[PDB]
Coordinates of C-alpha atoms in Angstrom, one line a residue:
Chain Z
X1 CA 8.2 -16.6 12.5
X2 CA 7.9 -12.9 12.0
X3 CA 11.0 -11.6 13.0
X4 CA 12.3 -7.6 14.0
X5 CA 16.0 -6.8 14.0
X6 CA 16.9 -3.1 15.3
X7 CA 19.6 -1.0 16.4
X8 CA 20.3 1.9 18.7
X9 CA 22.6 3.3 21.4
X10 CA 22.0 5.1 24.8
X11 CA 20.8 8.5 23.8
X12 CA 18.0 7.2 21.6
X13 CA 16.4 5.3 24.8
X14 CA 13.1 6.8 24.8
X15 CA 12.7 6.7 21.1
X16 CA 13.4 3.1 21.1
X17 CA 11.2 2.6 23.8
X18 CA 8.1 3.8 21.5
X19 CA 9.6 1.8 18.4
X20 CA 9.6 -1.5 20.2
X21 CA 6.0 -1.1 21.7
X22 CA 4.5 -0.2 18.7
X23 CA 6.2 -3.4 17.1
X24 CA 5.6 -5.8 20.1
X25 CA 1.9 -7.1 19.6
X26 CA 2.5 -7.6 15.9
X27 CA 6.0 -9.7 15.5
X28 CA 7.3 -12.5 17.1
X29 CA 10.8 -11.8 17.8
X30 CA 12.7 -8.7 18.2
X31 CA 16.6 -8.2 17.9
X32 CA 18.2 -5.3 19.4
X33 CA 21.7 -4.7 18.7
X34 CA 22.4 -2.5 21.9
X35 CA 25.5 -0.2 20.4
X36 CA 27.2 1.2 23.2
X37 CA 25.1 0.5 26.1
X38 CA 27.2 -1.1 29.5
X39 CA 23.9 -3.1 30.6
X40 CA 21.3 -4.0 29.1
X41 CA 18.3 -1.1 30.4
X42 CA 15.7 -2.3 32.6
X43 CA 13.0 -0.4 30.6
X44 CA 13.2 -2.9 28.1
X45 CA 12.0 -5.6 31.1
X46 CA 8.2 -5.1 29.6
X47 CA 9.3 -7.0 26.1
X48 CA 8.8 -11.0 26.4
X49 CA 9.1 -10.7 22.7
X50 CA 12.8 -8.8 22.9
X51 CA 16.3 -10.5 22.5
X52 CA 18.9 -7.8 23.3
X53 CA 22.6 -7.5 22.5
X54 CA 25.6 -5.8 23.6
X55 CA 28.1 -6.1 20.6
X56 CA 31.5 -6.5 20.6
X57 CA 32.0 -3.5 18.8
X58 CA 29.8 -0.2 17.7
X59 CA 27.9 -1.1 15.0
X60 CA 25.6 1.5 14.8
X61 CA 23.1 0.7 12.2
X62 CA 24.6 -2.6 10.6
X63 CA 23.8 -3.4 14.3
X64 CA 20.4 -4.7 13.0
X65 CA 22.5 -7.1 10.6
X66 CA 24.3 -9.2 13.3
X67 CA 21.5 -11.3 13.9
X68 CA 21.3 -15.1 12.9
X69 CA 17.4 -16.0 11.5
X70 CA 15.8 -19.4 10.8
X71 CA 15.4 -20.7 7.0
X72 CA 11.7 -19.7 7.4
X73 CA 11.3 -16.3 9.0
X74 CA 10.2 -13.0 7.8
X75 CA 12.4 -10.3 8.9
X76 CA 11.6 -6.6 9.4
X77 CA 14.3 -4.6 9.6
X78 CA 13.4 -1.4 11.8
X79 CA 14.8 1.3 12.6
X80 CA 14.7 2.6 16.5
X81 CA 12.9 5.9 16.0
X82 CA 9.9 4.7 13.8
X83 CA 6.5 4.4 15.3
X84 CA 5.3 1.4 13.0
X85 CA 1.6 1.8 12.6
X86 CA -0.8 -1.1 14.1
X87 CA -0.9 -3.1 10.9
X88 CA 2.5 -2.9 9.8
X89 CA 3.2 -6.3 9.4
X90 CA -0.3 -7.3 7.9
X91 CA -0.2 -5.3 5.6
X92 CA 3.7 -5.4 4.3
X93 CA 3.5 -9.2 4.3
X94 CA 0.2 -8.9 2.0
X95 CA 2.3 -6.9 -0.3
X96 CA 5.3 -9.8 -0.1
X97 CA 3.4 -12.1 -0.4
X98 CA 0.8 -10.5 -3.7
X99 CA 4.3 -8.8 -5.1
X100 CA 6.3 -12.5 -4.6
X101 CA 5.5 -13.4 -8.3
X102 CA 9.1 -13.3 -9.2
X103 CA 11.4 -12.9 -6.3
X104 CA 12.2 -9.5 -5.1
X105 CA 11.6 -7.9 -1.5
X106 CA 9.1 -4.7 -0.3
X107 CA 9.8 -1.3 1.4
X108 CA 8.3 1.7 2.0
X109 CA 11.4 4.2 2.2
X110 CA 13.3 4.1 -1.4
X111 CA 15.0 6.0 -4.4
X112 CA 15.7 5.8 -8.0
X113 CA 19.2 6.9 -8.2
X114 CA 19.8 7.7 -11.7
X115 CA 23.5 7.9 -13.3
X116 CA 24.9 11.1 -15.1
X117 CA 24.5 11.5 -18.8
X118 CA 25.8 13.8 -21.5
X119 CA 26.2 16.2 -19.4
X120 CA 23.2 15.6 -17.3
X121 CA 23.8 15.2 -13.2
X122 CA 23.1 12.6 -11.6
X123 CA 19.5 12.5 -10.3
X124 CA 17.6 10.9 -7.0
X125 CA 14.1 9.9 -6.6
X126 CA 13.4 9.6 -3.0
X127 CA 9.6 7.9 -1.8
X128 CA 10.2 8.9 1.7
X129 CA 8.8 6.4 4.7
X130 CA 6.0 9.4 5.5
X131 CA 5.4 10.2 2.1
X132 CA 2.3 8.7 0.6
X133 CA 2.8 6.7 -3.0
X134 CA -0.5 5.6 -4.7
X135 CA 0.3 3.0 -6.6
X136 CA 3.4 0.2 -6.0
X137 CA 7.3 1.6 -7.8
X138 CA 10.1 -0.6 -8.6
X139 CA 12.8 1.2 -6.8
X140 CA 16.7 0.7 -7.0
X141 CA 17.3 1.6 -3.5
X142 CA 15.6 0.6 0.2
X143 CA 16.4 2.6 3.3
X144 CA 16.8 -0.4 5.8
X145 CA 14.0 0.6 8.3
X146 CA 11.2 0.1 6.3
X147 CA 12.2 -3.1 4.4
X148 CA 10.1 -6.6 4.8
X149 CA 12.0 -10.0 3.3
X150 CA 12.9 -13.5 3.7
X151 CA 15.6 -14.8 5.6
X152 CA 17.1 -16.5 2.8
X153 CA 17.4 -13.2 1.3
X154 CA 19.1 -11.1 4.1
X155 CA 22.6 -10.6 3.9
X156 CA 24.7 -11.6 6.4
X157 CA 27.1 -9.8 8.6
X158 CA 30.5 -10.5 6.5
X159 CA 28.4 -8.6 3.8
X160 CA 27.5 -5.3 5.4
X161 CA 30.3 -5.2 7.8
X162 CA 32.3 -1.4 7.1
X163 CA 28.9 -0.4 5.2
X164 CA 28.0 1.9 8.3
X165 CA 28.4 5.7 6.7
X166 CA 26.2 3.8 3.4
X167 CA 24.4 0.7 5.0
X168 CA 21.2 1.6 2.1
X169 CA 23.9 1.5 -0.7
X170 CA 25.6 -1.8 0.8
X171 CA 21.8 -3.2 1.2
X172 CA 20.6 -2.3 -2.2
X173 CA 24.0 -3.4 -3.6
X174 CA 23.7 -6.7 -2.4
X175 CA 20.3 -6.6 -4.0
X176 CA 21.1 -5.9 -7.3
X177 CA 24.1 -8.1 -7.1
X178 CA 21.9 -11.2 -6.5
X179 CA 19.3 -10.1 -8.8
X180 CA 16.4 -9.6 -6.1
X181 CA 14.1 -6.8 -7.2
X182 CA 13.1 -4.2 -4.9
X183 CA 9.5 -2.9 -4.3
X184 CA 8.5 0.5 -2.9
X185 CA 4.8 -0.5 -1.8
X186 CA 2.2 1.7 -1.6
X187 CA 0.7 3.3 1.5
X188 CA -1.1 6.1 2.5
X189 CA 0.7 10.2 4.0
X190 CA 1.8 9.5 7.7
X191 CA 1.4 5.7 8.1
X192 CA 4.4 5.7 9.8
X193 CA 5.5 8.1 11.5
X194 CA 9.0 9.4 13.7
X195 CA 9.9 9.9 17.4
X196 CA 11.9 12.6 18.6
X197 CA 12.8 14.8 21.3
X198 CA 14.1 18.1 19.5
X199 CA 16.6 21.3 20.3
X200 CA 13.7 22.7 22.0
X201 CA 14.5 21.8 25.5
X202 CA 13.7 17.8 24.6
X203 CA 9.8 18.6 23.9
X204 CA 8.7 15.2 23.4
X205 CA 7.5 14.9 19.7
X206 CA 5.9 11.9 18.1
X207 CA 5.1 13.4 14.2
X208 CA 8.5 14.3 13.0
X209 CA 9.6 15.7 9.9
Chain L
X1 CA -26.1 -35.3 14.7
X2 CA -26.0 -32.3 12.4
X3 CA -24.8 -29.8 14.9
X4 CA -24.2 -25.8 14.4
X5 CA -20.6 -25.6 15.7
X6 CA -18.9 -22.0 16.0
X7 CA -15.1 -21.8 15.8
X8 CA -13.3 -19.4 17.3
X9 CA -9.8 -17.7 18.6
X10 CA -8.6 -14.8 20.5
X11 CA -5.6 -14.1 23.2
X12 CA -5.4 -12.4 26.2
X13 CA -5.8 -8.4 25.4
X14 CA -9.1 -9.7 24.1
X15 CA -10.5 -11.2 27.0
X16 CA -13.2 -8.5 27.7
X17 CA -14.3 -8.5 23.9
X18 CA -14.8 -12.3 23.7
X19 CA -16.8 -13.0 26.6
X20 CA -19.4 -10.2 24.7
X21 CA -18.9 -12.2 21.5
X22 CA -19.3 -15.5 23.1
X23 CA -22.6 -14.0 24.5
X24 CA -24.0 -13.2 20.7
X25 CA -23.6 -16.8 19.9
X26 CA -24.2 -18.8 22.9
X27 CA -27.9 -18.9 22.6
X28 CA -28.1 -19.5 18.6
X29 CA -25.1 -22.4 18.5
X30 CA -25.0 -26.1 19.6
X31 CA -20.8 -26.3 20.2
X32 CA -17.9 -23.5 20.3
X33 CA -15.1 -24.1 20.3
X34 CA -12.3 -21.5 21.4
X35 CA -8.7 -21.3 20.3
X36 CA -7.3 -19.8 23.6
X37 CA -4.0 -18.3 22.2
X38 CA -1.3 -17.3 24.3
X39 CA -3.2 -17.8 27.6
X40 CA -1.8 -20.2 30.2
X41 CA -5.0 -20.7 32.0
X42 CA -8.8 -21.1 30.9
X43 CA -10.1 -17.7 32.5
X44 CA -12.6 -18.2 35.1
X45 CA -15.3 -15.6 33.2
X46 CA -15.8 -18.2 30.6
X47 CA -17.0 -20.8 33.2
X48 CA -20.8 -19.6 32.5
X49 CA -21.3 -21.0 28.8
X50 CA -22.3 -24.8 28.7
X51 CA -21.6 -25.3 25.1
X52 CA -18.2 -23.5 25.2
X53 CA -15.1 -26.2 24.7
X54 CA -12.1 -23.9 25.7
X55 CA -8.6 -25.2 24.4
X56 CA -5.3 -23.7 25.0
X57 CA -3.3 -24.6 22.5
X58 CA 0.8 -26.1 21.3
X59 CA 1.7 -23.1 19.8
X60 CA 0.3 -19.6 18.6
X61 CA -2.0 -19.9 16.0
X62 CA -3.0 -16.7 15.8
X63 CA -6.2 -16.1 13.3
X64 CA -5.5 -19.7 12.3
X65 CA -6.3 -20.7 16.0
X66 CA -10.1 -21.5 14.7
X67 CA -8.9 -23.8 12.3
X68 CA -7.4 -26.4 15.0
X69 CA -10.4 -28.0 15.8
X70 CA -11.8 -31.2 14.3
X71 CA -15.2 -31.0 13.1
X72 CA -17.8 -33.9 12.3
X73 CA -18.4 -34.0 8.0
X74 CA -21.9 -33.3 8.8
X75 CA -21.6 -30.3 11.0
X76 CA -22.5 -27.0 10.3
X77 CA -19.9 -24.2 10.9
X78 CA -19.5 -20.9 12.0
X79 CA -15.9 -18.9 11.6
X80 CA -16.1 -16.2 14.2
X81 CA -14.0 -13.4 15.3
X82 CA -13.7 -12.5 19.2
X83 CA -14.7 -8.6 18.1
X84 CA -18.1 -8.8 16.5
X85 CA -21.9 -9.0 18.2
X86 CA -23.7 -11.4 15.9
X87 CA -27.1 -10.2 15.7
X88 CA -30.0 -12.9 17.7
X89 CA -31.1 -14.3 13.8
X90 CA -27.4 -14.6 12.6
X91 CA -27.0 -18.6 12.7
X92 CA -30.9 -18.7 11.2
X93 CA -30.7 -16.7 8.6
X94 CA -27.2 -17.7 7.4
X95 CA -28.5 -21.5 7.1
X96 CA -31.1 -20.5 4.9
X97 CA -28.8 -18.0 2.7
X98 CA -26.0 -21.3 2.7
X99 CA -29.2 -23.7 1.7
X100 CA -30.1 -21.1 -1.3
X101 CA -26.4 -21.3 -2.6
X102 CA -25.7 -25.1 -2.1
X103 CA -27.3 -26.1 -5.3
X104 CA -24.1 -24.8 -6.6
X105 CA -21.6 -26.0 -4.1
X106 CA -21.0 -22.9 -2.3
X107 CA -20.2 -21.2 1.1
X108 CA -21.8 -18.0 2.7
X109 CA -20.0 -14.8 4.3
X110 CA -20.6 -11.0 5.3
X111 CA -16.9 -9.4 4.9
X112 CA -15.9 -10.5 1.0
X113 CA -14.1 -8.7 -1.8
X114 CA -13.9 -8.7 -5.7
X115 CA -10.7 -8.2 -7.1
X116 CA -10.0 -7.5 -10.6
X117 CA -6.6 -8.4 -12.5
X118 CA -5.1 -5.6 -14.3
X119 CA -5.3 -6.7 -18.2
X120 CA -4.5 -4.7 -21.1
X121 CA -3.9 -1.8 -19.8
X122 CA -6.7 -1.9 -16.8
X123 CA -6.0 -0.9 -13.6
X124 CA -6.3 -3.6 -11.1
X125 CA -9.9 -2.9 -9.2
X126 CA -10.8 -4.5 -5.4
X127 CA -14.2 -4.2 -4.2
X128 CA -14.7 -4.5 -0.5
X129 CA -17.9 -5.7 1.3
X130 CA -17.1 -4.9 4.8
X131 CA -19.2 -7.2 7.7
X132 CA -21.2 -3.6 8.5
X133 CA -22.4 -2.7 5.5
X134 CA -25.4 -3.5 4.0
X135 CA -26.3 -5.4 0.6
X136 CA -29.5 -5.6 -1.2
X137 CA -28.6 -8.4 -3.9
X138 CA -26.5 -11.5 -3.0
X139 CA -22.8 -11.2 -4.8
X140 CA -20.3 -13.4 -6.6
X141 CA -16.9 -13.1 -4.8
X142 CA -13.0 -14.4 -4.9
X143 CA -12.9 -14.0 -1.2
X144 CA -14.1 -14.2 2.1
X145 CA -13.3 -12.8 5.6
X146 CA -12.9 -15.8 8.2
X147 CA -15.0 -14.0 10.6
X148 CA -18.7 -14.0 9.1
X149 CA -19.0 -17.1 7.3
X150 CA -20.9 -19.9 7.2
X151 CA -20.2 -23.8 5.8
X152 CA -20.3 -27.5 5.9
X153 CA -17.5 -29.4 7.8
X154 CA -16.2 -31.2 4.7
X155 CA -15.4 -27.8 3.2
X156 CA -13.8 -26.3 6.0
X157 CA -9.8 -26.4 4.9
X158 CA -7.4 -28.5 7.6
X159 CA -4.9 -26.9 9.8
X160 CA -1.9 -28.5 7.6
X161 CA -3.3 -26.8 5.0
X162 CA -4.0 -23.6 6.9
X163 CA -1.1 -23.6 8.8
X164 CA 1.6 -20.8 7.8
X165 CA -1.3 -18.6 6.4
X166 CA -0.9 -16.2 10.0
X167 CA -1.9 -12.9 9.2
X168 CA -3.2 -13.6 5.4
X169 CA -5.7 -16.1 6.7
X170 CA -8.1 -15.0 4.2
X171 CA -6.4 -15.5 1.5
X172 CA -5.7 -19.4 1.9
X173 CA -8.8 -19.6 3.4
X174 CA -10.2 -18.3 -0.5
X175 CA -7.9 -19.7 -2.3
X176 CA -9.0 -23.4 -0.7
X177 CA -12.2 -22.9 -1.9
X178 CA -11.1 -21.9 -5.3
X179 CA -8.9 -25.2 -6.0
X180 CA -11.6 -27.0 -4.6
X181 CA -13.7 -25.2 -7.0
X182 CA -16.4 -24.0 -4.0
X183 CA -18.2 -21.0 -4.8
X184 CA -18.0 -17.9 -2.5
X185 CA -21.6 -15.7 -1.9
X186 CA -21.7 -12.6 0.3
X187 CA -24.9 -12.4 1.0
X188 CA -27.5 -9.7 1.5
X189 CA -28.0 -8.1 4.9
X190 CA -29.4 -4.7 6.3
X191 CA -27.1 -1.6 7.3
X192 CA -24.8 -2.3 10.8
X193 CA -26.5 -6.1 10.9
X194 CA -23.2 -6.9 12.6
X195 CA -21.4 -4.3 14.9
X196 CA -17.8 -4.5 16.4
X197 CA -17.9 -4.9 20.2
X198 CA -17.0 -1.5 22.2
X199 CA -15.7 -0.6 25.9
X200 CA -17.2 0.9 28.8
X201 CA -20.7 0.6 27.1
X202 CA -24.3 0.5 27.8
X203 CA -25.7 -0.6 24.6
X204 CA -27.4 -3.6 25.3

């Protein structure tokens, strides 16, 4: 099963909306941690596909990390204000599955933080998730909205819990910790893009920067 | 007894699309057969077709739906897709492209691709023949789209086999015929041979 697990919390409503329809067609299964929300909000009744949540606590975006998956699945952890584009998961599971020659997990958002040196600063690489990237980088940091793995390879709840404030560092950490490499995949400028409404008297915006 | 059998899947957004499709085929075709994904109920605008076998499946198969069906050894068959018009000589001249190529134990398609490893310091090169283009010489290739091909029954991969391949059909479906050491031709055809099917259109 090809499996979505998202966050959000009542303000980001109509972003969220966007984000699950433009993952619906293409996974089959989406997890919505529900941060903050008293019931469960009946413009979500269109999703068969949807499996909402109202924790036990706020989250925020760990919230996408209290989900339990199957030994099998394919998880695509989201983020609630990304339109995903309509061959999202075709194409990111081509990459897992080309890329899989030696264990390591894909993403489109990532960095190369590199460490301070004789007296040079530390430095950061970021491959934004509307940026363009040619050809594929090894990375050694994914932003957790853009990332495409195996179950077996998600960590769980006890592992990301108090990582809200740094939930890409925790993610990455746990990574690197169990030697998994990490894959910034190649796509062309805009495949994704962000939902929004702005300052501007809520203007409804769906190409966000 | 040797029968031209088209295989096919689709789900319910598609419903408009495939009864066009189904059209194409119906004429040129002895069987198809017609992975109804995610329906709950054979819909009543396929009742025209004689030669149609609907079947709504245990599960979604998705683009693996095709492969469900069990085929007799000596059956010809046709892997479709629910959004292309195959042209009135589709079926006629594929046989006689798939005769050509069986001297050397081969299958037949329209979409294919020729990828190249990166090696010493190459860059890794893919060359797509998409199912509208045309192609003047008939070409050697590592795979095949599941939608414009053309084979026997006994090379036609099972659904064990094909089962888990959702969404990267293609591939398994190429690599089967690599470990089974069939070859792969995509054959020559004229510009926009095959179209994709539209909406709201007086073409035909």
């Amino acid at each position: 099963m090809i499996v979505a697990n998202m966050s959000s919390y009542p303000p980001r409503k109509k972003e969220l909306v966007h984000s699950i329809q433009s993952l619906h067609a293409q996974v089959d299964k989406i997890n919505l941690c529900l941060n903050e929300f008293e019931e469960i909000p009946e413009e979500l009744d269109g999703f068969s596909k949807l499996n909402p949540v109202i924790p036990d606590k706020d989250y925020k975006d760990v919230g996408k990390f209290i989900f339990p998956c199957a030994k099998n699945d394919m998880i695509v952890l989201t983020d609630d204000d990304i339109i995903y584009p309509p061959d999202y998961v075709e194409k990111m599971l081509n990459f897992y599955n080309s890329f899989a020659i030696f264990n390591c997990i894909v993403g489109i958002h990532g960095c190369i933080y590199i460490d301070a040196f004789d007296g040079d600063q530390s430095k950061r690489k970021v491959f934004s998730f509307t940026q363009g990237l040619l050809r594929p980088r090894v990375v050694n940091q994914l932003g957790t909205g853009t990332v495409f793995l195996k179950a077996d390879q998600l960590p769980s709840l006890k592992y990301m819990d108090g990582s809200q404030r740094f939930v890409d560092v925790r993610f990455s950490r746990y990574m690197l910790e169990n030697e998994i490499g990490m894959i910034c995949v190649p796509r062309e400028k805009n495949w994704l893009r962000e939902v929004s409404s702005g300052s501007m008297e809520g203007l409804w915006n769906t190409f966000t920067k």
